[PDB]
């Protein structure tokens, strides 16, 4: 097949109305461009991450994540002088930067 | 709201039922009674038009954001 | 308003919509078994123009009225023509065919805009033949013959000459011509003559035809026949003037067949016509019977042969001048036993 | 008392007699708007339905004019 | 005010309910600022014969 | 022209109001009258009920019917609510005071 | 309502893949879709609200005597000009509002992260509904138009009918300007990705017969195709896109 560019012309094709070579080329045209342009009627209809995203699950997760983070704010009756600060380094990041600074003189 | 509405209905009923009240405020209470008994019919027609107005703007990509096209 | 009521409300809402979906599925399986049941939504259309909607979910592109596909415009050539729209130049068009050398009769007369490049003429002729209720074998009784006749008749139309083209003297000239007309509609025949200045541009034939049919109370075929007769005879005098090289500004008419058809100058004395000469210039609406109607049914431009306007009647119920075939005034079907 | 003065909606397209005939017609015939506009006269049924929608009946029993009602 | 108005609205969508705000459409100035769409919808419902 | 065509169709809607009768009854060129008639019949309004058919019979399932509506139905739309009266005795005193 | 119930009944049928919508049998539906998408793109860049205007919506509701009627305004107390308008308005360029300030070249993955950070927001307005806002109504009409137009173009006859249709080429050259140069009018950030995600699909099926109209469209095609993929931080400025 792989019919033509002349078979795609408007003269050899039907229009809103109101030969043999044309009716032979339009067989191969409609037999080529209906196995090429047909959509996939099976799975892999996900196509990406941002099509199977769920508004209901994210809305439920945000309803939980706002409620518990607001219960963290108001109901935690620890005064501001008593809120102890967290460490800016870990127990492993403080070992690796003692190791690499020891090995930095090479 | 419902108790104040019932009290106003029973108050605009009494203003016309007696005969010592003047006719300038005897027929005005009558039409105020008419307008108060016509309230849930107004709610029905008002609800109907607004339900059709809401159905004007349902477009299947608001309610269905996970529509698979092709 | 607590939790134990707010979930019991949602159970007495989901169980409603599950029964609603059962109804929706049953009303689908009913129509799939060729039983016309109603749905949650109403029945969509009726038989009026658009198709019956309560069906098995096909795609029906453009369910036609009668047997014709809807006319799809261009909407760009319409604006390309309607903005470059200087003049009109209406064309009188005559169609005559007989049972000999042709099969159809088709005695319709129409105006046509010469500057109109929008409508294809073969499409209008094909619409006209469908309006005359010709069956679908209408190409061996060609649409091409009528299309070629109308294509020839608009090519010969030389237009309104230099009386409109180059100069336009306000008031025109003394060129008053003797218009005669002879129109047959139903069984009435309008016979009337008058005078018409062919040298004036602001002479409106249609505004005079409506004026005459106002006074005589004519049906309306005479409205579109009188104006067509004026447009016909004025054009067939303008063509005979232009083919003899008239040079339309300076008059100097200088001929013998014409200048004898033209009328002389009205003096002070001739502002009243003689009495025996007056009885020609008056409209007579004669009535004719079947014998005369059968006699009329068979029988450089020649300005002596002024044709008559007989028309084959359109198959129309209400309109005067057309036969009453087809769908009736009453809406019946007559299923008998 | 805080009574709803319903006949003060006498804006120039309508009138007090028109509102009275409107209310008496809707009390006569329930929601058949052709008979209602027939009883009123000189007005289309759409204007009757619109003026029946736009009546301030229950606004003088609600809380606010137009701070806020809150939750 | 955005934490409250996006919490009750976060409950309306998750419950499945829909529609206008009940306390907004209960007054009379709603049907005076929306005077345009009501003259359309009243004619549409009346001419189709559903009013 | 438009009022003539629309008034002339609505005297007998079962008849296809052709272009040729409109051309024969009002004075004008055939192109503009043909374009106006095709525009008019494009939007319904004329030749919309030439060949009308009858819908036979509707076997109606429940809840798909006129007067098939119940107070027990859920108001998904129709945003006006019916609210539960709270009968509590301190709230009774509050309602008596307010 | 007549627009929305036509758009929804087109969107259900066009995505069905068992009911064919052929334009050989009817080629004026596509012109209605494209002219509607043109006129919605026009009053979105100017923030005009259609469908509920308080204007009258009706036009002029109502020889040798025009000089007589001129002096009739004299002895009672005792020629109109031409009009000009077009079928379609300006493409969206040559408007006084629309002048380019920043070509929005956002990549694919940053658009995905912006979508996932807008959905997973506490004060999100991604579901504010249709009847509560007219701008989201215009955007959800345009998204339906784009889903319909990407659904129609999977047929052998529609792909060569849509190829011309001057209306569709003008609508494509009209939306591709708005989604790349001034995307500030689209409400959500998923609609801006979804317009690029079906414009490329509808241009994948057409382009074997497409003749590009203007050079600005030929540049915006390049920028749209470039906008898929991940760049780096001369050399090759595009890290390889792994097809997982």
UniProtKB/Swiss-Prot annotation, chain A:
The keyword Transcription regulation appears for this protein: yes
GO terms for biological process, alphabetical: chromatin remodeling; maturation of LSU-rRNA; nucleotide-excision repair; positive regulation of transcription by RNA polymerase I; positive regulation of transcription by RNA polymerase II; regulation of transcription by RNA polymerase II
Any one annotated GO CC term: cytosol
Keyword Isomerase applies: no
Keywords annotated in UniProt: Activator, Nucleus, Phosphoprotein, Transcription, Transcription regulation
Chief site of localization: nucleus
GO MF term set: rDNA binding
Subcellular locations according to the entry: Nucleus
Subunit composition and interactions: Component of the SWI/SNF global transcription activator complex. The 1.14 MDa SWI/SNF complex is composed of 11 different subunits: one copy each of SWI1, SNF2/SWI2, SNF5, SNF12/SWP73, ARP7/SWP61, ARP9/SWP59; two copies each of SWI3, SNF6, SNF11, SWP82; and three copies of TAF14/SWP29.
Function: Involved in transcriptional activation. Component of the SWI/SNF complex, an ATP-dependent chromatin remodeling complex, which is required for the positive and negative regulation of gene expression of a large number of genes. It changes chromatin structure by altering DNA-histone contacts within a nucleosome, leading eventually to a change in nucleosome position, thus facilitating or repressing binding of gene-specific transcription factors.
Something else known: Present with 2900 molecules/cell in log phase SD medium.
Name of the featured protein: Transcription regulatory protein SNF6
Organism: Saccharomyces cerevisiae (strain ATCC 204508 / S288c) (Baker's yeast)
Swiss-Prot record, chain C:
Protein name (database record): SWI/SNF chromatin-remodeling complex subunit SNF5
Summary of subunit composition and partner proteins: Component of the SWI/SNF global transcription activator complex. The 1.14 MDa SWI/SNF complex is composed of 11 different subunits: one copy each of SWI1, SNF2/SWI2, SNF5, SNF12/SWP73, ARP7/SWP61, ARP9/SWP59; two copies each of SWI3, SNF6, SNF11, SWP82; and three copies of TAF14/SWP29.
Subcellular location field: Nucleus
Recorded family membership: Belongs to the SNF5 family.
Function: Involved in transcriptional activation. Component of the SWI/SNF complex, an ATP-dependent chromatin-remodeling complex, which is required for the positive and negative regulation of gene expression of a large number of genes. It changes chromatin structure by altering DNA-histone contacts within a nucleosome, leading eventually to a change in nucleosome position, thus facilitating or repressing binding of gene-specific transcription factors.
Misc remark: Present with 217 molecules/cell in log phase SD medium.
Swiss-Prot record, chain F:
Cellular compartment(s): Nucleus
Known role: Involved in transcriptional activation. Component of the SWI/SNF complex, an ATP-dependent chromatin-remodeling complex, which is required for the positive and negative regulation of gene expression of a large number of genes. It changes chromatin structure by altering DNA-histone contacts within a nucleosome, leading eventually to a change in nucleosome position, thus facilitating or repressing binding of gene-specific transcription factors.
Note from the entry: Present with 3150 molecules/cell in log phase SD medium.
Subunit structure: Interacts with RTT102, SWP82 and the N-terminus of SNF2. Component of the SWI/SNF global transcription activator complex. The 1.14 MDa SWI/SNF complex is composed of 11 different subunits: one copy each of SWI1, SNF2/SWI2, SNF5, SNF12/SWP73, ARP7/SWP61, ARP9/SWP59; two copies each of SWI3, SNF6, SNF11, SWP82; and three copies of TAF14/SWP29.
Protein's recorded name: SWI/SNF complex subunit SWI3
Gene name linked to the record: SWI3
Included range, full protein: 346 to 443 of 825
Swiss-Prot record, chain G:
Further details from the record: [SWI+] is the prion form of SWI1. [SWI+] is the result of a conformational change of the cellular SWI1 protein that becomes self-propagating and infectious. This conformational change generates a form of SWI1 that assembles into amyloid fibrils. [SWI+]-aggregates sequester soluble SWI1, resulting in reduced growth on carbon sources other than glucose, reminiscent of a partial loss of function of the SWI/SNF chromatin-remodeling complex. [SWI+] can be cured by GdnHCl and by deletion of the molecular chaperone HSP104, which is required for [SWI+] propagation.
Cysteine disulfide links: none
Family, as annotated: Belongs to the SWI1 family.
Cited function: Involved in transcriptional activation. Component of the SWI/SNF complex, an ATP-dependent chromatin remodeling complex, which is required for the positive and negative regulation of gene expression of a large number of genes. It changes chromatin structure by altering DNA-histone contacts within a nucleosome, leading eventually to a change in nucleosome position, thus facilitating or repressing binding of gene-specific transcription factors.
Cellular location(s): Nucleus
Annotated protein name in UniProt: SWI/SNF chromatin-remodeling complex subunit SWI1
Gene it is expressed from: SWI1
């Amino acid at each position: 097949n792989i019919p033509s560019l002349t078979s795609f012309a408007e003269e050899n094709n039907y229009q809103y109305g109101y030969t043999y070579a044309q009716q032979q080329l339009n067989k191969q045209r409609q037999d080529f461009e209906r196995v090429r342009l047909r959509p996939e009627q099976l799975s892999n209809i996900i196509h990406d991450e941002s099509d199977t995203i769920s508004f209901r699950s994210n809305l439920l997760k945000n309803f939980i994540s706002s409620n518990d983070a607001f219960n963290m704010l108001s109901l935690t009756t620890v005064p501001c002088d008593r809120i102890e600060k967290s460490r800016l380094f870990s127990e492993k990041t403080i070992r690796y930067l003692m190791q690499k600074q020891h090995e930095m003189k090479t | 709201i419902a108790l104040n509405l019932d009290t106003t209905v029973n108050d605009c009923l009494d203003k016309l039922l007696n005969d010592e009240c003047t006719e300038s405020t005897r027929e005005n209470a009558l039409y105020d009674y008419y307008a108060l008994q016509l309230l849930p019919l107004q709610k029905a027609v008002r609800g109907h038009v607004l339900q059709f107005e809401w159905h004007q703007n349902s477009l299947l990509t608001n309610t269905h954001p996970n529509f698979l096209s092709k | 308003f607590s939790n134990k009521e707010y979930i019991s409300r949602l159970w007495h809402t989901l169980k409603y919509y599950q029964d609603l979906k059962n109804t929706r599925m049953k009303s689908i399986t009913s129509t799939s078994q060729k039983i016309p049941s109603a749905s949650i939504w109403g029945n969509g259309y009726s038989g009026y123009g658009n198709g019956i909607t309560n069906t098995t979910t096909r795609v029906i592109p453009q369910v036609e009225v009668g047997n014709r596909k809807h006319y799809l415009e261009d909407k760009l050539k319409v604006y390309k023509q309607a903005m470059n729209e200087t003049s009109e130049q209406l064309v009188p068009i005559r169609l005559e065919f007989d049972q000999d050398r042709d099969r159809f009769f088709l005695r319709d007369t129409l105006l046509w805009n010469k500057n109109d490049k929008l409508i294809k003429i073969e499409d209008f002729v094909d619409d006209m033949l469908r309006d005359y209720r010709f069956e679908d074998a209408t190409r061996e009784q060609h649409i091409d013959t009528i299309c070629q006749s109308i294509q020839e008749q608009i090519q010969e139309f030389q237009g309104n000459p230099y009386i409109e083209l180059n100069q336009d003297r306000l008031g025109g000239d003394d060129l008053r011509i003797r218009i005669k007309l002879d129109i047959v509609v139903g069984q009435n025949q309008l016979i009337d003559q008058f005078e018409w200045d062919i040298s004036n541009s602001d002479n409106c034939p249609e505004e005079f035809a409506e004026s005459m049919c106002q006074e005589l109370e004519l049906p309306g075929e005479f409205v579109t026949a009188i104006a067509h007769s004026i447009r016909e005879q004025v054009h067939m005098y303008h063509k005979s003037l232009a083919l003899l090289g008239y040079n339309f500004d300076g008059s100097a008419i200088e001929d013998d067949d014409i200048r004898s058809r033209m009328l002389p100058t009205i003096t002070l004395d001739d502002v009243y016509r003689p009495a025996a000469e007056s009885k020609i210039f008056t409209p007579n609406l004669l009535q004719i019977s079947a014998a005369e109607l059968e006699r009329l049914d068979k029988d450089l431009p020649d300005i002596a042969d002024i044709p008559r306007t007989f028309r084959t009647p359109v198959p129309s119920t209400l309109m005067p001048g057309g036969v009453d075939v087809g769908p009736s005034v009453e809406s019946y079907e007559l299923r008998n036993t | 008392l805080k009574k709803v003065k319903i006949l003060e909606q006498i804006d120039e397209n309508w009138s007090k007699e028109d509102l009275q005939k409107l209310l008496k017609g809707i009390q006569e015939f329930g929601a058949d708007w052709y008979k209602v506009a027939k009883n009123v006269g000189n007005k289309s049924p759409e204007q009757c339905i619109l003026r029946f929608l736009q009546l301030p009946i229950e606004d003088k029993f609600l809380y606010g004019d137009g701070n806020g009602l809150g939750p | 005010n955005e934490c409250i108005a996006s919490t009750s609205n976060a409950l309306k969508v998750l419950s499945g309910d829909e529609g206008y705000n009940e306390d907004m459409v209960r007054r009379a100035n709603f049907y005076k600022e929306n005077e345009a769409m009501l003259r359309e919808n009243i004619e549409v419902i009346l001419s189709n014969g559903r009013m | 022209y438009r009022n003539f065509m629309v008034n002339s169709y609505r005297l007998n809607p079962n008849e296809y109001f052709s272009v040729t009768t409109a051309r024969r009854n009002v004075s004008g060129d055939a192109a503009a009258l043909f374009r106006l008639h095709k525009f008019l019949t494009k939007w319904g309004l004329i030749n919309y009920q030439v060949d009308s058919k009858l819908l036979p019979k509707n076997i109606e399932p429940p809840l798909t019917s006129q007067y098939s509506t119940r107070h027990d139905a859920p108001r998904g739309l129709f945003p006006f609510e019916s609210y539960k009266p709270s009968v509590q005795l301190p709230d009774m005193a509050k309602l008596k005071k307010m | 309502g007549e627009i929305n119930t036509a758009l929804n009944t087109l969107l259900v049928t066009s995505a069905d893949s068992n009911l064919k919508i052929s334009l050989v049998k009817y080629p004026e539906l596509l012109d209605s879709l494209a002219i509607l998408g043109m006129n919605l793109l026009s009053n979105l860049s100017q923030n005009v609200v259609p469908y509920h205007r308080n204007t009258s919506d009706y036009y002029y509701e109502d020889q040798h005597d025009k000089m007589v009627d001129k002096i009739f305004e004299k002895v009672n107390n005792n020629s109109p000009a031409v009009k000009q308008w077009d079928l379609l308005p300006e493409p969206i360029r040559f408007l006084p509002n629309q002048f380019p300030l920043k070509i929005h070249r956002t990549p694919y993955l940053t658009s995905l992260k912006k979508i996932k950070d807008e959905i997973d927001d506490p004060f999100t307005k991604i579901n504010t509904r249709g009847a509560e806002d007219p701008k989201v109504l215009i955007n959800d009409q345009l998204s339906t138009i784009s889903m319909i137009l990407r659904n129609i173009s999977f047929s052998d006859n529609n792909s060569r009918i849509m190829s011309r249709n001057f209306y569709l080429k003008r609508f494509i050259s009209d939306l591709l300007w708005l989604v790349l140069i001034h995307p500030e009018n689209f409400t959500c950030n998923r609609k801006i990705l979804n317009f690029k995600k079906d414009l490329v699909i509808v241009l994948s099926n057409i382009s074997h017969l497409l003749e590009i109209a203007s050079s600005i469209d030929c540049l915006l095609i390049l920028i749209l195709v470039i906008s898929f993929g991940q760049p780096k931080l001369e050399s090759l400025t595009f890290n390889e896109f792994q097809l997982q």
